[PDB]
């Protein structure tokens, strides 16, 4: 049903810039899921995982 199941489903970003801040984006090496497919940010981005920007597909949850 969910994009992964219960992982970091976009826009459940990994960070704000720092850990404690409510998120704002995914940084270099930080992964996320977007409709089955798993992606990782190349540098810094908050677009749509897979829509170029700074994304790179690492796999798929489901």
From Swiss-Prot:
Region spans: Cellulose-binding: 3-62
Family affiliation: Belongs to the glycosyl hydrolase 5 (cellulase A) family.
Gene name of the record: celZ
Source taxon at top rank: Bacteria
Function field: Represents 97% of the global cellulase activity.
Protein name: Endoglucanase Z
Protein localization: Secreted
Disulfide bonds: 4-61
Residues of the full protein shown: 367 to 426 of 426
């Amino acid at each position: 049903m969910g994009d992964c199941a219960n992982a970091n489903v976009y826009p459940n970003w990994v960070s704000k810039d720092w850990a404690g801040g409510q998120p704002t984006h995914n940084e270099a090496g930080q992964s996320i899921v977007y409709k089955g497919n798993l992606y990782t940010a190349n540098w810094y981005t908050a677009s749509v995982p897979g829509s170029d920007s700074s994304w790179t597909q690492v796999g798929s949850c489901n």
